[PDB]
Amino acid sequence: IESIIKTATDTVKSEINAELGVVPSLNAVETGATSNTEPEEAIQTRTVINQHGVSETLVENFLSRAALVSKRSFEYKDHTSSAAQTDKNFFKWTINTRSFVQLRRKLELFTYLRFDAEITILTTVAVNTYMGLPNLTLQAMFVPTGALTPEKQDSFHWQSGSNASVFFKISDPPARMTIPFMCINSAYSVFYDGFAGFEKSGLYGINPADTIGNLCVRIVNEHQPVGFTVTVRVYMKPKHIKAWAPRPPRTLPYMSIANANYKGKKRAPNALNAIIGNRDSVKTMPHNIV
Amino acid sequence: SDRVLQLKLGNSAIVTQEAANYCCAYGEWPNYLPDHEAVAIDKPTQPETATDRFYTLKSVKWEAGSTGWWWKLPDALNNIGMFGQNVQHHYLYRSGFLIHVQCNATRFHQGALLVVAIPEHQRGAHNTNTSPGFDDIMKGEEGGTFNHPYVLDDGTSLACATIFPHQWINLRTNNSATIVLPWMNAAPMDFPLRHNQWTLAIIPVVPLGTRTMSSMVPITVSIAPMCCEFNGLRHAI
Amino acid sequence: NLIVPSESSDTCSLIGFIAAKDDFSLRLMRDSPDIGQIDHLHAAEAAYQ
């Protein structure tokens, strides 16, 4: 039954027990229920007034940590003889939570998530001699998924009629935006057991309703006579979080961001056929006190 | 008292005598879609006893080096009975499921099955970065076989798979498992031919063993849809 | 002793489970040592293309 739990529960004292018909330490794993044997029923306990709060394991606290989701370095220079596969003073990024594995395993502890995401953008610059670091203006434009993204630094898509842009400088504090809960469903599917199109040639596991959008970031300045290397780090913090149906954590290393494929490490720990590193026997104690 | 159980849905009934207390998934029971959560505005068809009835699948042979079996829902039932005809003639779909898994043997046999229902079991492939295709996922009535059930074929773990709605068939205790599933989706209804809400996984955690005469031990799966709605009537694909 | 007859399998199995009770408490949050990367994942550059 649902109740409000602010601290961990208290222990009551117990006595010698010797009753027929009552066996609380015996259980039934086969029902799928966890054992309800209390510590008062297994040993003799004392009264403990437990004042240990439980507020740090709240799902709001467990997930609302600003985590790196994007890291992109591009050369900020005059791009005339640069190849067309490079970032000519701007980049595009489809917003995902799959690329960096600390937030990914943490969000994949749940099947469904409903959250607002606040987005911190940290820009840092390095000289590509030394003459000083420029205080450049960057534009981060939020483009929805599948819409027209800019193809140039100076394209006319950067004018942002209805697309939300943030203009920010390197010497400022980092730019911070709140992106709302933007799914067309009532929760994001962290896992999607399906195909996202009506044909049999779509992608497995990728629901585009889960995708937030594109993040097109340019430098508004023109090129200086020297080049610079600009690294843009994007940080996501979930907030106002509801979470449903928890899952086993991922044990094997991630291979891709598109799928849940697995290889495992070559030896234990976290190998395919051995998640926990090995000991000599089942009656061998690894860190035995001498 | 909790070992005997008759499940009566439609014209189908199942009596069992060697069962456990059955599992309702996440404490929830199936229901129809209420008006304050509805999206599709046309009147749904609720065929009830024509579709809310047990559907028994093909049995699987529990053998020596079995790794496990999985069926995806509603994909395992999309071509069976009047459930499959309502699936193929409609665009939308909403139901829960009453899964009953049967496996018995003698009192000289040993073995344990983990009968676990997994929501949104997105699978992974082994030793490649190409995603699984359509035919790897949409098996249908026959279902599939686990390749690496120790990581649940998705890089996670079988050990922590008791966080999902599950039971056990330990052959010295029970011979059946029963899991009642509600609707488990982010959307209130769904297109049943491209998305699976539940995967029934049956996994040999303790293998089958005896020293008496060798009999075939089958594992039978009966699935009853519960509270079926169908929206978006058209032709059949 | 584990005592079986001649048609039971002479080697039997246990499965061990562990949970926490409701007096359990965790604090001071840190990143898990169970996951980590030394390179970008596959198709992560394709999110920039």
Binding site: I1, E2, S3, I4, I5, K6, T31, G32, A33, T34, N36, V54, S55, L58, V59, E60, N61, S64, D116, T178, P180, F181, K239, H240, P246 | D2, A20, N21, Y22, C23, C24, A25, Y26, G27, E28, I163, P165, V180 | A19, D22
Partner: peptide
């Protein structure tokens, strides 16, 4: 401190102390 006109702009809501472990630990019916 929320001077924005949208409700999702607010800070994190760390006051949800409602638990129900019995939907995972005792999901059996009887």
């Amino acid at each position: 401190i929320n001077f924005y006109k949208d409700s999702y702009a607010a800070s994190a809501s760390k006051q949800d102390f409602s638990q129900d472990p019995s939907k995972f630990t005792e999901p059996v019916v009887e």
